[PDB]
Amino acid sequence: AAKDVKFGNDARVKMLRGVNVLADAVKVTLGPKGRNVVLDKSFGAPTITKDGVSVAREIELEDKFENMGAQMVKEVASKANDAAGDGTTTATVLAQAIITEGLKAVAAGMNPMDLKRGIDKAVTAAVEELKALSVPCSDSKAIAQVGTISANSDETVGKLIAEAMDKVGKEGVITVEDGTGLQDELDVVEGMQFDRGYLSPYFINKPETGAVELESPFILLADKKISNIREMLPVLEAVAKAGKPLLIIAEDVEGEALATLVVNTMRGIVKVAAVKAPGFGDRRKAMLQDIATLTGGTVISEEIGMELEKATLEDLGQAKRVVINKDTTTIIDGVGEEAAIQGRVAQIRQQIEEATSDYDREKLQERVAKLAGGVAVIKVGAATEVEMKEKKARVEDALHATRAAVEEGVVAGGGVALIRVASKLADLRGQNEDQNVGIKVALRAMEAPLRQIVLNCGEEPSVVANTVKGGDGNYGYNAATEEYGNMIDMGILDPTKVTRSALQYAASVAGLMITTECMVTDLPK
Amino acid sequence: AAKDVKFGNDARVKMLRGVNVLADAVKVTLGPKGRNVVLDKSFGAPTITKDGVSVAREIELEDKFENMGAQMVKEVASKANDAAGDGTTTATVLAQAIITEGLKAVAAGMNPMDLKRGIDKAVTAAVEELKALSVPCSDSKAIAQVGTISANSDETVGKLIAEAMDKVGKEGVITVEDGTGLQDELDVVEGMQFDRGYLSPYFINKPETGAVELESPFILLADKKISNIREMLPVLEAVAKAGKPLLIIAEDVEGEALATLVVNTMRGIVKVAAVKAPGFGDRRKAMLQDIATLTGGTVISEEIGMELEKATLEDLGQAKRVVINKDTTTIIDGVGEEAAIQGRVAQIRQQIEEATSDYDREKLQERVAKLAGGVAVIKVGAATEVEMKEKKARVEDALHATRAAVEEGVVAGGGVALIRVASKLADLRGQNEDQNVGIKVALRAMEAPLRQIVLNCGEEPSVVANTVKGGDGNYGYNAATEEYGNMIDMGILDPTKVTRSALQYAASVAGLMITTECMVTDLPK
Amino acid sequence: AAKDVKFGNDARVKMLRGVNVLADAVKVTLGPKGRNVVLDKSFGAPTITKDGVSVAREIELEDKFENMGAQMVKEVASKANDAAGDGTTTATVLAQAIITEGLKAVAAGMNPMDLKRGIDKAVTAAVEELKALSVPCSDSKAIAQVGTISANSDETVGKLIAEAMDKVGKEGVITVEDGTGLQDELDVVEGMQFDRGYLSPYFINKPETGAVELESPFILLADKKISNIREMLPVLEAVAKAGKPLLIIAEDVEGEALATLVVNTMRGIVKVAAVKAPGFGDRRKAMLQDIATLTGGTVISEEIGMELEKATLEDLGQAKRVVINKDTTTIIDGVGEEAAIQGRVAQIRQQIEEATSDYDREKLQERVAKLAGGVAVIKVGAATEVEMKEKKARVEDALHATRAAVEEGVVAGGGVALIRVASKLADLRGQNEDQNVGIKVALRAMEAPLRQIVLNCGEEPSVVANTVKGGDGNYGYNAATEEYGNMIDMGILDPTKVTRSALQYAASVAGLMITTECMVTDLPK
Ligand SMILES: Nc1ncnc2c1ncn2[C@@H]1O[C@H](COP(=O)(O)OP(=O)(O)OP(O)(O)=S)[C@@H](O)[C@H]1O
Ligand SMILES: Nc1ncnc2c1ncn2[C@@H]1O[C@H](COP(=O)(O)OP(=O)(O)OP(O)(O)=S)[C@@H](O)[C@H]1O
Ligand SMILES: Nc1ncnc2c1ncn2[C@@H]1O[C@H](COP(=O)(O)OP(=O)(O)OP(O)(O)=S)[C@@H](O)[C@H]1O
């Protein structure tokens, strides 16, 4: 249809208004003293949250240009949430600060490209500075501490995650379930994990989590693109007879198959999920064979000559539980015999031994690692079901934070790590005046998180930020107790990975938005 | 015309809007880094001043309610300006802070009368605390220093005023005139000073100063009322023949009389000024006799039998120069023979000896003091007339500040005196929660001057105020150099009298405005 | 009346709009290729002018805020025109450039006071750099060259001015009149000159010139203020009987006195103009005695005992021509006997010999210099009266330019002197980022004159400016012939004084306007 275009400073001010609205709405809820925010609900009373993810999710503006600006910031913030699992509102606050200052400078008659270059130089120097400031978190004591502080200062969950990490490994697979008894339960069973996402969001049976849970499902092993709906009618009839859910791996699934599966899921006669095949090519087939060994299934491939129509329930694999993430998959206790698993592990081990290519050897090594280590199961334990759900959520977010800290490290939280990095990089200079201005914009924008936290606490942000900058090391402000002190000693810690990802993505979106003129959008109607 | 009434919270918000407009307008120009403000000139280019008095002079609003709120704040600020000769902007800033906080608290359902009581208690404690902090300025060194810093750091004027104060005395009289040569000149001649103001503003021959300078004027002495214009027609004919200015001292001037004098001055045929007689009763007659001795005139009184109609030029007194301040007068070098002057001084001295009442004795003592000390005169010396004017203005404001410091004392400037007083009174408590809230409002409003100065400098006012409060003694912020340090060492000083008067008057207007409801005003037409 | 106040960024943008309108209107006419600007005339055909002073004299905006911003820029530009006799639109262009860039930077959150400090540092460095670049113009050849260039490339006027300034002196006084003969003639006669201006603009009888010519007038020498009209009644009757315009030289003129004189001049019965007395004190009295010797008049002083009423026509002084410039006076061929003039010169010479004070000795030197050198008189010669007027104007403006060049020097014109100065100061830095940016704004604003000239020529301004910057010395762009080359070789030159004054005044107004917030003005009615 007809499209209204807007280029020049008016496009920038529209984008600024949109990001200002979104950033205010989501930054009000930053820190431990985060002020509540109320989201309208269609039916019933409104929900009340301090989680910035929900606030961002429920933001879109009436004006088209402001809405697109807000949507850009929202998308990059959600990307940051996906990368590290936390620091969404920190990313949005950093983005708002950098964009506000950068667009102000651009309106001040400066070159957008040089500003973006200066900001990029500043942020990469800041990233390597964070890596310098990073403190390793390999010891189980710090693992327990970070798990504790992530889960609202609960030592039991920190202990549980520490034991699970020791049991499986540093880079192992950890999952959380519900336990019958009041006592917490831990057990390690042969499982699976590969990074692939669901084909359509509609497969999510629990939207509040964004995943699926399929108790004792059949898993279908396919190496051929899903072309026609006629290929999986016999298996659909079989699973309808079984009255037990189903999951599908495939090289790809075409749009008509997506529509058919969505229709079947809303119908509810069969609950089926589908996910992209892992790996690529010959190794995709190798790990499909690994999954066949796990679940007792069989790979169905056109090259072999097998067809999906002639598939029996025995040919299908099974597990006792499967969970799909937005961009990951996990299978727990494939029914396949463990002796066959050991044989396959040995076979891939000799494949590693004969391997000469370094990267192929890396794929084989990670394959044997994921095929031997398996998965961990941490069944939460308490009395009532409401506390089952809340403690399960606490375990989930603590696990995310702890693994993020393990991957890269852990730095002084409360926004003090960025303050220290900015103070360290005070002497950085670019190739001209505009790059210098961009670098200074980045440096003064990295102080946004601490200032916003202090403002939420109600104290004067300028005074607290100046005092924190005056100090050195990890000396910082405690929002909870409103007392200064070494942040590590008082246990306020966040992963290096989350802060790095939030900073990098905020810088990326700010650079992208600074150098934008044209705004093509639908005519308001 | 009809009159509409607005009472309740709407009256308060209208008042707050008006005082906010006036306070912004005048406070932008506070301190050494005061931002310029440009004003209206109907004919010609606009004028620019950093002098807050000029800004407040030109502020009146469209809406009647806001206009009268601004007029009240302007009136009390000008009263402060008249009391101590400085601190108008400080007074307005304090008034705005106290009024804003007090009305915000009154909107919170607190009792206005208790808030006023708390503010009054806080300001009385503050005034006695200032008197505690006050440093004497008796030595001529501090006199020179304060004169120097008052006159844009000019040591010559400080030296001049130091010598003048040494010569004429601590509480003597000092005047400033234009000198002939480039060298500064000083002389002392028998004179006069009594506290009375002009009857109408229209007599001001130089509106930019507010005084009435008269070169070689004839002073006429009258003791009774000015009833009819027929009484001084021969006087007007004689002075017109003389072609020289005239001044009239009388018990009082009627409305018709001052109307005709204004008309004649507008005509320009006779340059006549009117001022009320000094003293009271038989003491008034005694000082009129003193003035007769000073100027060689003769007191005209109906009780004696003499009349104003039978006035001859010989009976008229004369002086070399007379200046009529808004609320003071000064006669310099009375033509009257000095022999009679010391005769009268001796006579009033023997009157002092026989005096029994302490009040009459004090009046006689001050009479002999003014009759013997006379008036010192300081003539400014330079090459050009523009520097004549500017240096004369510098000497005027410098001697105003110096006498203000001499009367009471001198405290650390830059708004740090009020900061220290507020920090000292942090433990002051009232009789009930509302009084305590009022006291805290006053104390937190005492930090307005320093905060505004820092904001004008462009720095973060919160950080600087916190740093200054953290320090003790006279540690403070230097606006000019933007460096901390002992204010007295860097010479930033202001009289205790000006700060005390500004604080007291701001508190008075704020209390009187907090407890107001009914805004009776004319309809907008 | 009620005055509305506007403060913050809205005040600045309104001022920017006003100065933009004025600057466009007046800068369109800059340079030899200045595009015509046709004003409006109430009666008759419109006037068409490329003269910046003429066009800028009329722009006043309908909106109050824009109007006063334009009035400020117009006032400072007219001050620049008064200082050096030229450089109006150059000053306005510089002011517009600095204002635009400075307010653009202030909108970028930067500290206005630091910006003003940086601009002031840049402009003072630029001024001393101009003084470094200055070339002396003492040789008569360059004097004739600059006179020729100023007067639309006329060699005769250059020859005349060079001859006259050789005859009288380098720092003499030169006047232009009309001559009967077609041949140009020059003669020097005893005269007088002192820097004082008319009391009322209404005294101007030829508004297009700004002064009043008096043919064979009487001059009334007075020492006191003219208190009453009755003092000047007998002399007014005498001069009315004489049927000749009168001059009044006196210590001061009152408001009533000048109102009466304006009324009398509008009546036309007496053509009287009044001017404030020169010098000060005893120096004033001495130079009035000199004037008495020059004109054969007599000093009237109350201290001596003489009065203005008892003034006879014999007591009056005489001359044969008098011109009252806006801030200068000049009388030609005082009737006073030359022997008395020589005696007075000798007397002041012995006063010089006995003088010990340096400044009084300088005053006596300048007194004898003006009393002995006299005045140069150059009467223009041609056929018709239209060319009388145009060549007289050419001689006047060429004389202004030549004397301005003589006072200070002469640098390469075409706006290239400012370009070279800016290129020389590229490494100048302030005390922080804000001052650096202010300095850069000042430097990049000094390329505005050349860019505007080139844009008026129709070429690409950036290309020509870059080419000129690439060159060194006086290499530049010739607007008239379109070709590059050494400026001094082509002869087009600008006095150092005019460029320095325009730059300084533009910087002063820009600093004064950058630090402005509040805009109090009459409510639009
Ligand atoms: N007691 C504390 N004092 C100061 N800062 C704290 C404290 N506890 C946590 N923080 C910091 O507050 C920030 C929390 O960021 P938020 O994004 O508001 O919450 P979150 O835990 O990151 O979950 P998200 O990102 O909103 S989904 C992190 O930078 C923490 O390091
Ligand atoms: N160098 C300085 N640093 C800090 N404060 C200063 C400095 N010089 C003066 N002050 C303070 O600033 C105030 C003087 O500025 P203003 O009060 O705005 O003007 P003023 O000279 O007092 O006359 P006004 O405008 O009629 S009040 C006083 O409170 C001084 O103590
Ligand atoms: N032939 C020329 N080529 C280039 N620049 C020239 C030339 N003649 C004069 N100029 C410049 O033009 C400016 C003078 O402005 P003009 O408006 O053209 O004339 P003007 O009225 O004498 O000067 P103004 O109005 O005070 S700026 C100066 O900067 C001169 O150096």
Side-chain angles (χ1 to χ4, degrees), chain A residues 329-366:
Chain A
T329 300
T330 302
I331 308 85
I332 302 93
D333 204 338
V335 171
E337 176 49 45
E338 302 177 356
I341 284 283
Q342 190 273 329
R344 189 58 169 164
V345 163
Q347 292 151 26
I348 305 162
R349 200 141 294 176
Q350 291 97 25
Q351 286 155 28
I352 292 166
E353 297 315 305
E354 59 85 19
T356 71
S357 159
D358 59 337
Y359 64 91
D360 282 334
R361 202 179 322 163
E362 286 297 323
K363 328 303 194 181
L364 298 153
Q365 274 157 209
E366 73 184 4

Side-chain angles (χ1 to χ4, degrees), chain B residues 220 446 464 503 523:
Chain B
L220 194 143
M446 277 197 220
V464 178
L503 172 61
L523 266 293

